[PDB]
Amino acid sequence: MGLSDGEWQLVLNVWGKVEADLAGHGQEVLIRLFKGHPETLEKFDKFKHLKSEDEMKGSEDLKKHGNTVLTALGGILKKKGQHEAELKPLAQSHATKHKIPVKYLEFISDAIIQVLQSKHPGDFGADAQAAMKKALELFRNDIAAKYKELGFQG
Ligand code: HEM
Incomplete structure (x- = not known):
């Protein structure tokens, strides 16, 4: 249940493209998630209301969460599976x-x-x-x- 060195290299090679614009990618990832699975909006405090006013795009909340989610994930992927230190608190949250x-x-x-x-x-x-x-x-x-x-x- 692990990735080979070459599998990790494939992951980090494409992650290079994401690192060029973490916030733009992260906002896009969340929009994608919310369009495909709108039920996930219920877990946040502000996105259902923003969506109800046609204001998710360009909102401060989407920016903050887009940056948070992919900044964190990138740090985890760079650990190449040795990520207990990150995942114990992340699971708790x-x-x-x-x-x-x-x-x-x-x-x-x-x-x-x-x-x-x-x-x-x-x-x-x-x-x-x-x-x-x-x-x-x-x-x-x-x-x-x-x-x-x-x-x-x-
Ligand atoms: C790649 C997967 C994810 C990552 C890396 C991630 C990362 C984070 C981080 C870094 C925090 C801040 C607290 C902490 O640092 O432990 C957080 C909080 C949170 N995450 Fe995630 N998250 C992920 C997936 C999700 C998903 C799929 C949802 C909901 C459908 C979600 C909902 C939340 C919520 C509701 C909070 C609390 C934010 C608040 O209090 O406003 N997360 N996440």
Whole structure:
């Protein structure tokens, strides 16, 4: 249940393209998630209302959360699987006061794939797509183990 060195290299090679504009990519990832799975909006404080006023795009809340989610994820991916230090607190924040089911982590993983396919088709071929899916699977499987310890079924 790990990635090979070459799988990690594929992941970090395409992540280079995301690092050029973390905030723009992160906002896009969340929009993708909310369009494909609008039920995920219920987990935030401000996006349902912004959406109700046709104001999600360019909002301060989308900017803040877009930066947060991909800044954090990039730090985790660069650990290449040795990420317990990051995932213990991250699981706690997504399993306690805010309860984020694993299916929603699955959905944002799919959203990341779709955004990268759309924005960087020439840098996101078959092997890179498979490796990124596998990294994101590892990412939520290790979160899910911590969910179990935390008493959250996911
Ligand atoms: C790639 C997956 C994700 C990453 C890396 C991530 C990252 C973060 C980070 C860094 C925080 C700040 C607290 C902390 O630093 O531990 C946070 C909080 C939070 N996350 Fe996530 N998150 C992810 C997925 C999700 C998803 C899919 C949802 C909801 C559908 C979600 C909902 C929230 C909420 C509601 C908070 C609390 C924010 C607040 O109090 O306004 N997260 N997340």
